[PDB]
RNA sequence: GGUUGCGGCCAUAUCUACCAGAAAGCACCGUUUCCCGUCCGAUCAACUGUAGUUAAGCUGGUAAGAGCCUGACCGAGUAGUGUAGUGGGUGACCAUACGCGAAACUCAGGUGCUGCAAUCU
RNA sequence: AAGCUCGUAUCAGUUUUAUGAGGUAAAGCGAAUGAUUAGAGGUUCCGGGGUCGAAAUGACCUUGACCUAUUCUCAAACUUUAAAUAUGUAAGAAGUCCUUGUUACUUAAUUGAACGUGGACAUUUGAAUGAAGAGCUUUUAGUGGGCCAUUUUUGGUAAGC
RNA sequence: GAGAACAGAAAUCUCCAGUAGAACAAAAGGGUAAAAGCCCCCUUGAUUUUGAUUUUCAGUGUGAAUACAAACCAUGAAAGU
């Protein structure tokens, strides 16, 4: 009764679009991310799309058309296990590897793998992807983070640093990486270099592997069962970095089924509309039952 | 003494004696107000084609 | 049913609205400092009233939001002043209840001679797990009506815990 | 005194719409505009930078030069006894593709297609357009459609 | 003190209502629009008589007042105080204007003639089109001759021509007598203070059972 | 077909009260050692996916639901209006001739469709 | 007035087709704003009064606002909707389609953008009707107090205002 | 709208509802809601060089503005502005 709106208020309500209503598309920013220079008539203004969710890291490169946005390359974190990463697919180091998994993957189908190798040795230096002499002006893409807020140490920017190490020319500044100093306007590469390899999760492994065991047995259990210790937390990621460069071929899955049986098993658990004839016969019954004095 | 302030009377009829026709349309219109960056490119592209055709049709 | 729709306190707010600005608030915030353990923030004045003697942005009040076990810890011993009785009128339609106290001399800061004597406006906000869909920036939704706390749900939870009781109404 | 500004008497003209206020959809920016494209000029009150004059609302023009975020438009303007050439700079929010030219282009395709098929047999396909001709004869029959006679009705007040 | 009604009988100017651009106007001299048994229910007054306008003109707010009192007095003293309900349909909303000039000798020295001649409000009026109902009185069928004579007497207080017409509708409703009668035998009508609420098939079914219950208990 | 990431049209997509939701996913959900922001780890920065829960979110369905969209010989060829007469009428205004033609009302129907990719008993 | 260049066309105070634009006439107020008539039903820990009460967040009758569903009437500076008459653009050869040369601009990319090279489509060659020749230039006169009629319209009681 | 000591119709605090019914210097009309509103951070792009264009119009001047081109910067992770 209190939350009752008149027909006058409802009629004149102009709805937000469809993804402003879902809190999904910050259209004000997206207007900048897809609008092209007109003199570049049909050049796709590509976009590094990383969206962060519980239990997965999603990396896609997307351009925009009038009928809809188009994606050419996609990288996820649930496909990192093929490189030997089954634990911690939601940390700043997994959020790194996807930016590196996508970079080789998107540079594969573009044919720019031979050049723009990126930064092969992991050091953490703030170094933009340089343009090679008489070369194809390396691939240019841009971040959109959406409604997530930019800070220092945000794990959205492990994807960008994971991309520039892969050769993708993504413009950036060095002030929003974990390790940047606010007092003196610079960053220490050594402390950042650890976070590429999981520096923050590094020391917390051994410091409470012996002090607290009741907690260290509840969580971090997969590491205990798989016998992963603090000292091996770096060389496993080194394997992935050389694994990404080896086979970015991105083989698909088998789906254990086809598209038909997925729908066929799901058509029986949905609910369907009620027929126009059925609705009226449902109205008539309620009149004779309720208003019919039983 | 007051007078008439403004009328448009007889103004349209004067305009139809030698009337209001569309002036002309020429081919190859002027390049006034065009982006200079594209205009510098146009000259260099234009010279290249003319010189290339001159060599072919020497 | 009722697997994860238990009632738990969102937060506990303490308000102290002084009618003036001066040295009182410097020490009126001290009783907030020791009782809560966390520093308080002043409340400005939105508009002049010229009868309360409050000017624009004159820092007339001070309050602190308390969350977690300490708010529960503050509530029980603070409510001990109210001798564990409470009017249902203090409960709101949307599901929030509170109480006020004079002469904070009773608890914690017992007399603290420098600051003087002050009162409090306690307030307790309830919810159930899942309320952050109203707060989180992405997919900001609205709690369902089944999950929504009701006035009768709050008073029933008040009886069971602390074995308290409600006044006439 | 009198008041003739830039947006004089534009109250309802730049009034936004009913139930369409707010940020504009991004099809308006995804568009691609060539030199020689025929465009119409409908303003947009929200976007204040690069609006045209009131005189060009609904006027159709043609693009001559294109810029980063805007477009130049050639408009012929009647002043005096003549047309003076007028050049306007417009952001792509207040410009939309004129559809008037479009149905002529689809007519060309059929017009080019019909001649190509006709020359295989030479039947004088008659590619021109005809206006609506006077109707030709027909027979209307009264099986189950027997005429019913209507008469003028008398007067009544109905109030 | 007041100009003759001759000067404002015709609709020469645009409507000039009260607004934030006038902010000062003389008040209307008609303020009562319902007379007689306005408290009556719908179905005790099956007869409706209208007084219509056959002209496009302006009726003064103060001519409405004079016409109202004369028609009220006759019907009260003949038919009965509560035998009818009289409604003045049209409301005065148009503001009249006067350009004040000095009526004394030597006035041609200090009034500036036609310069700055925008007038000030001195009266109100109504605007009535062809066939617009002016008065509508609802009463019993036996009271036909009385209310006809009442409107005939009030017809002398209005400029122009007016007609007296019996309404085919039941009282003040918009349904004619046979349709209201067949909508009254069923539960399709519910009494109100002076009007009646009609059942309609659009809306929630639970609501439509709460009101008009006898419509379904057949 | 469900779900998710990114969108196009921007209510046939909204709002109110209920019902149901298998798998996976989203989700709620746990912690402050780590970078970061707060009166407050509430939002968020960071970490785990393990101790858990479909209660909320979301999706679909229901309602002679409200709103909205579509159509109609439904109102209605009505209101209005271009053009004509040495038409009518004291006037106010009206009819007629050749054309164009609403809105409210009434009734009926409907309550998202769709692109790229990944993914799902 | 002098002509000039051409010889039926890059034409037109017109209609048709297709496509736009507009906020007037009308209409509307059980739609926003504002104005506005009447009763009906409800709620006050929280309006004013009379009754039973020492008072109650006690009860009863009335008046004021408040909410709900209705009801009568409206707007130049109000409006969801929205004409008629007017108004912009197009209806080809300067068009369409195909291949590929230039560039110091642009693109991850001979990717595009503009300009060209070569080839194909001619009298129903791309609606109607008419065209009295068409396009262009120079110079110079008088005029720069206007007034009336149908329709629209403002001030004014009105006026051969 | 429902609640909290002083605290009431106006102090400060909490929740629910809430398409703008607020505010954005002034006049008014348009416009604007993860902003164009309110708070925090940094800076002077209120810079430099001359051109084109719209409005009023004679297609003169003046004022205002539009989109550019060549430099030097600010902000932001960046797109961009």
From Swiss-Prot, chain A:
Pfam families assigned: Ribosomal_L18_c, Ribosomal_L5e
Gene that this polypeptide is encoded by: RPL5
Protein's name in the database: Large ribosomal subunit protein uL18
Residues modified as Phosphoserine: 164, 173, 232
Function recorded in the entry: Component of the ribosome, a large ribonucleoprotein complex responsible for the synthesis of proteins in the cell. The small ribosomal subunit (SSU) binds messenger RNAs (mRNAs) and translates the encoded message by selecting cognate aminoacyl-transfer RNA (tRNA) molecules. The large subunit (LSU) contains the ribosomal catalytic site termed the peptidyl transferase center (PTC), which catalyzes the formation of peptide bonds, thereby polymerizing the amino acids delivered by tRNAs into a polypeptide chain.
Record field: transmembrane: none
Tagged with keyword Ribonucleoprotein: yes
Gene3D superfamilies: 3.30.420.100
Location(s) in or outside the cell: Cytoplasm; Nucleus
GO biological process terms, semicolon-separated: cytoplasmic translation; ribosomal large subunit assembly
GO-annotated cellular components: cytoplasm; cytosol; cytosolic large ribosomal subunit; nucleus
Keyword annotations from UniProtKB, A to Z: Cytoplasm, Isopeptide bond, Nucleus, Phosphoprotein, Ribonucleoprotein, Ribosomal protein, RNA-binding, rRNA-binding, Ubl conjugation
Family: Belongs to the universal ribosomal protein uL18 family.
Main subcellular localisation: cytoplasm
GO molecular function terms listed in the Swiss-Prot or TrEMBL record: 5S rRNA binding; structural constituent of ribosome
Alphabetized CDD domains for the sequence: Ribosomal_L18_L5e (cd00432)
From Swiss-Prot, chain B:
Comp. bias regions, Basic residues: 1-25
Subcellular location, principal: cytoplasm
Subcellular location: Cytoplasm
GO terms under biological process: cytoplasmic translation
Residue numbers spanned by region Disordered: 1-36
Cellular component terms per the entry's GO annotation: cytoplasm; cytosol; cytosolic large ribosomal subunit
Biological function: Component of the ribosome, a large ribonucleoprotein complex responsible for the synthesis of proteins in the cell. The small ribosomal subunit (SSU) binds messenger RNAs (mRNAs) and translates the encoded message by selecting cognate aminoacyl-transfer RNA (tRNA) molecules. The large subunit (LSU) contains the ribosomal catalytic site termed the peptidyl transferase center (PTC), which catalyzes the formation of peptide bonds, thereby polymerizing the amino acids delivered by tRNAs into a polypeptide chain.
PANTHER family for this protein: 60S RIBOSOMAL PROTEIN L29
Record-given protein name: Large ribosomal subunit protein eL29
Species the sequence originates in: Saccharomyces cerevisiae (strain ATCC 204508 / S288c)
Swiss-Prot record, chain C:
Molecular functions per Gene Ontology: RNA binding; rRNA binding; structural constituent of ribosome
Keywords attached to this entry: Acetylation, Cytoplasm, Methylation, Nucleus, Ribonucleoprotein, Ribosomal protein, RNA-binding, rRNA-binding
Modified residues (N6,N6,N6-trimethyllysine): 70
UniProt modification remark: N-terminally acetylated by acetyltransferase NatA.
Subcellular location: Cytoplasm; Nucleus
GO biological process, one term: ribosomal large subunit assembly
Listed transmembrane segments: none
Additional detail: Present with 21200 molecules/cell in log phase SD medium. There are 2 genes for uL5 in yeast.
Family per similarity comment: Belongs to the universal ribosomal protein uL5 family.
Subunit structure, interactors included: Component of the large ribosomal subunit (LSU). Mature yeast ribosomes consist of a small (40S) and a large (60S) subunit. The 40S small subunit contains 1 molecule of ribosomal RNA (18S rRNA) and 33 different proteins (encoded by 57 genes). The large 60S subunit contains 3 rRNA molecules (25S, 5.8S and 5S rRNA) and 46 different proteins (encoded by 81 genes). Component of a hexameric 5S RNP precursor complex, composed of 5S RNA, RRS1, RPF2, RPL5, RPL11A/RPL11B and SYO1; this complex acts as a precursor for ribosome assembly.
Protein's UniProt name: Large ribosomal subunit protein uL5B
Species of origin: Saccharomyces cerevisiae (strain ATCC 204508 / S288c)
Biological classification of the source: Eukaryota, Fungi, Dikarya, Ascomycota, Saccharomycotina
Curated annotation (Swiss-Prot), chain D:
Cell compartment(s), UniProt: Cytoplasm
Transmembrane parts of this sequence: none
Gene Ontology annotations for the cellular component aspect, listed alphabetically: cytosol; cytosolic large ribosomal subunit
InterPro entries assigned: Ribosomal_eL21, Ribosomal_eL21_CS, Ribosomal_eL21_sf, Translation_prot_SH3-like_sf
Gene Ontology biological process terms, A to Z: cytoplasmic translation
Keyword entries, A-Z: Cytoplasm, Isopeptide bond, Ribonucleoprotein, Ribosomal protein, Ubl conjugation
Cross-link Glycyl lysine isopeptide (Lys-Gly) (interchain with G-Cter in ubiquitin) placement: 31
Matches recorded under Pfam families: Ribosomal_L21e (PF01157)
Gene3D superfamilies linked to this entry: 6.10.250.3260, Ribosomal protein L21 (2.30.30.70)
First-listed, main subcellular location of the protein, grouped into a coarse class: cytoplasm
The keyword Isomerase belongs to this UniProt entry's keyword annotation: no
GO terms for MF: structural constituent of ribosome
Similarity field: Belongs to the eukaryotic ribosomal protein eL21 family.
Function, in words: Component of the ribosome, a large ribonucleoprotein complex responsible for the synthesis of proteins in the cell. The small ribosomal subunit (SSU) binds messenger RNAs (mRNAs) and translates the encoded message by selecting cognate aminoacyl-transfer RNA (tRNA) molecules. The large subunit (LSU) contains the ribosomal catalytic site termed the peptidyl transferase center (PTC), which catalyzes the formation of peptide bonds, thereby polymerizing the amino acids delivered by tRNAs into a polypeptide chain.
Additional free-text comment from the UniProt record: There are 2 genes for eL21 in yeast.
Protein name, as recorded: Large ribosomal subunit protein eL21A
